Design an enzyme around this catalytic site. Structure first.
Site, PDB file in Angstrom:
ATOM      1  N   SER A 146       1.795  -5.795  -6.043  1.00  0.00           N
ATOM      2  CA  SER A 146       1.338  -6.268  -4.731  1.00  0.00           C
ATOM      3  C   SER A 146       2.518  -6.281  -3.767  1.00  0.00           C
ATOM      4  O   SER A 146       3.155  -5.224  -3.600  1.00  0.00           O
ATOM      5  CB  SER A 146       0.546  -7.566  -4.878  1.00  0.00           C
ATOM      6  OG  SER A 146      -0.058  -7.868  -3.634  1.00  0.00           O
ATOM      7  N   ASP A 254      -8.510  -1.197  -3.489  1.00  0.00           N
ATOM      8  CA  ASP A 254      -7.736  -2.402  -3.740  1.00  0.00           C
ATOM      9  C   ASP A 254      -8.305  -3.590  -2.969  1.00  0.00           C
ATOM     10  O   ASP A 254      -8.613  -3.488  -1.776  1.00  0.00           O
ATOM     11  CB  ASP A 254      -6.295  -2.149  -3.329  1.00  0.00           C
ATOM     12  CG  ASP A 254      -5.409  -3.314  -3.631  1.00  0.00           C
ATOM     13  OD1 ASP A 254      -4.921  -3.407  -4.773  1.00  0.00           O
ATOM     14  OD2 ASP A 254      -5.222  -4.152  -2.729  1.00  0.00           O
ATOM     15  N   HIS A 303      -7.093  -5.586  -8.143  1.00  0.00           N
ATOM     16  CA  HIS A 303      -5.785  -5.776  -7.527  1.00  0.00           C
ATOM     17  C   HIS A 303      -4.780  -6.114  -8.617  1.00  0.00           C
ATOM     18  O   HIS A 303      -5.001  -7.053  -9.388  1.00  0.00           O
ATOM     19  CB  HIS A 303      -5.837  -6.901  -6.472  1.00  0.00           C
ATOM     20  CG  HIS A 303      -4.575  -7.044  -5.673  1.00  0.00           C
ATOM     21  ND1 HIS A 303      -3.966  -5.980  -5.038  1.00  0.00           N
ATOM     22  CD2 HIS A 303      -3.796  -8.123  -5.423  1.00  0.00           C
ATOM     23  CE1 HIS A 303      -2.873  -6.400  -4.425  1.00  0.00           C
ATOM     24  NE2 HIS A 303      -2.751  -7.699  -4.639  1.00  0.00           N
TER      25      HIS A 303
HETATM   26  C1  LIG Z   1      -0.910  -5.550   3.985  1.00  0.00           C
HETATM   27  C2  LIG Z   1       0.439  -4.917   3.760  1.00  0.00           C
HETATM   28  C3  LIG Z   1       0.795  -3.736   4.402  1.00  0.00           C
HETATM   29  C4  LIG Z   1       1.992  -3.101   4.117  1.00  0.00           C
HETATM   30  C5  LIG Z   1       2.864  -3.645   3.196  1.00  0.00           C
HETATM   31  C6  LIG Z   1       2.551  -4.836   2.559  1.00  0.00           C
HETATM   32  C7  LIG Z   1       1.345  -5.458   2.849  1.00  0.00           C
HETATM   33  O1  LIG Z   1       0.929  -6.634   2.287  1.00  0.00           O
HETATM   34  C8  LIG Z   1       1.573  -7.081   1.098  1.00  0.00           C
HETATM   35  C9  LIG Z   1       0.645  -8.070   0.439  1.00  0.00           C
HETATM   36  O2  LIG Z   1       1.024  -8.713  -0.537  1.00  0.00           O
HETATM   37  N1  LIG Z   1      -0.576  -8.167   1.008  1.00  0.00           N
HETATM   38  C10 LIG Z   1      -1.700  -8.918   0.589  1.00  0.00           C
HETATM   39  C11 LIG Z   1      -2.849  -8.837   1.378  1.00  0.00           C
HETATM   40  C12 LIG Z   1      -3.997  -9.526   1.027  1.00  0.00           C
HETATM   41  C13 LIG Z   1      -3.992 -10.312  -0.123  1.00  0.00           C
HETATM   42  N2  LIG Z   1      -4.975 -11.098  -0.694  1.00  0.00           N
HETATM   43  N3  LIG Z   1      -4.471 -11.643  -1.774  1.00  0.00           N
HETATM   44  N4  LIG Z   1      -3.196 -11.232  -1.919  1.00  0.00           N
HETATM   45  C14 LIG Z   1      -2.850 -10.394  -0.908  1.00  0.00           C
HETATM   46  C15 LIG Z   1      -1.694  -9.699  -0.566  1.00  0.00           C
END
Ligand SMILES: Cc1ccccc1OCC(=O)Nc1ccc2[nH]nnc2c1
Ligand SMILES: *[C@@H]1O[C@H](CO)[C@@H](O)[C@H](O)[C@H]1NC(C)=O
Length: 360
Positions: A146, A254, A303
């Protein structure tokens, strides 16, 4: 119980609240392989949302409550039954306590309520491990899930450069980015960035970079230049700039991508607009992986994978992830291998069209 906590001896490298960062280590005396895993956990990008994270996600912002040990699971397991790939490796789990997608280089100070030191934490862990056996390594695999998977893409080449300048040019640095390959696509429903929940990732990361003093890989920075470094947080944009071998693991559908796209499934019938949105997302993800030679991308709504206990169960075209990673190792000895593929991207267009997808 297998991994033991070590707080960083350099007390200036800290979690968000100024407590020392650290790492969990399980050595394997026989082995010259080192697995350094970057934990995930979203991010925060302003004072108010970091304050809220400090209230209810404090282990992601502070070491004060960390346990003395953690159990290695999935690719961090030392049992071959659970980890066919690297069970005999030296195992390192780096807790994510910087809330900055592993990009930050700023200390807590009179002008900063929080420290965002993710990029410096990785460098300091590598430095301190060199005195604990990393100096004898042949391969250092920087892995992560993640936000930690994005952290691999942002940091794998800096780890390679750091080892070169410390006098260890023989250690082969490689990356394994799991569930960190996000798209800056159109959201299914859209909101202007007026608070935390309404702020699309591109805008949240642009603000985050300034709040964290975030750093990105040098070649990517030179392409996009000032004000546009947020682009380097998107795997398909940063990947072509990297020199270290990187294996990309990414579910085609995802759940974190869907969340940031404002898609919330309920189990009720999906109508045409959302059906086409989901199918187009899988197609776009597959397209971004077309020229990624080492990749594993199953058609599942899920995920993360690599630290899950049942990570061995998912297959693409009949090949599991531990097998694909083993084939990647063989391909890097220095022509494709018979029956040992490394590029495994599903082509079917809907979540769970692959029967081996995780159940939930
Ligand atoms: C969005 C994004 C773009 C480019 C790079 C990283 C990024 O985000 C990292 C992340 O960790 N995002 C994330 C989102 C939604 C979640 N819901 N639960 N865990 C979650 C983690
Ligand atoms: C401690 O970490 C800081 C920040 O990364 C660095 O500038 C400094 O040189 C480090 N000190 C030692 C002794 O490694």
């Amino acid at each position: 119980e297998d991994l033991r906590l070590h707080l960083l001896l350099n007390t200036s490298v800290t979690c968000n609240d100024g407590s020392p960062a650290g790492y969990y280590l399980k050595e394997s005396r026989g082995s010259r392989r080192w697995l350094l895993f970057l934990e995930g956990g979203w991010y925060c990008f302003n004072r108010e949302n970091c304050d809220s994270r400090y209230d209810t996600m404090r282990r992601l912002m502070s070491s004060r409550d960390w346990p003395r040990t953690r159990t290695g699971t999935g690719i961090l397991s030392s049992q071959p039954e659970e980890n066919p790939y690297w069970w005999n490796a030296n195992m390192v789990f780096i807790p994510y306590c910087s809330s900055d997608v592993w990009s930050g280089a700023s200390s807590k100070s009179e002008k900063n309520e929080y420290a965002f030191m993710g990029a410096l934490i990785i460098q300091e862990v590598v430095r301190e491990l060199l005195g604990r056996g990393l100096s004898g390594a042949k391969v250092l695999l920087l892995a992560g899930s993640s936000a930690g998977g994005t952290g691999v893409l942002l940091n794998v080449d800096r780890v390679a450069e750091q080892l070169e300048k410390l006098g260890y040019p023989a250690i082969q640095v490689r990356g394994l980015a799991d569930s960190g390959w996000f798209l800056d696509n159109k959201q299914y429903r859209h909101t202007d960035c007026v608070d935390t929940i309404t702020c699309a990732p591109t805008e949240a990361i642009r603000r985050g970079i300034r709040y964290w003093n975030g750093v990105v890989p040098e070649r990517c920075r030179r392409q996009f230049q000032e004000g546009e470094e947020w682009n380097c947080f998107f795997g398909y944009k940063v990947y072509p700039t990297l020199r270290s071998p990187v294996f990309v693991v990414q579910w085609l559908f995802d759940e974190a991508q869907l969340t940031v796209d404002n898609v919330h499934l309920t189990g009720q019938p999906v109508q045409e607009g959302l059906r086409l949105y989901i199918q187009n997302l899988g197609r776009e993800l597959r397209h971004t992986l077309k020229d990624v030679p080492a990749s594993f991308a199953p058609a599942c709504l899920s995920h993360e994978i690599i630290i899950r206990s049942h990570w061995t169960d998912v297959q693409v075209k009949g090949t599991s992830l531990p097998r694909a990673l083993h084939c990647w190792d063989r391909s890097l000895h220095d022509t494709p291998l018979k029956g040992c593929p490394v590029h495994l991207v599903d082509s079917c267009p809907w979540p769970h069209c692959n029967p081996s997808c995780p159940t939930g």
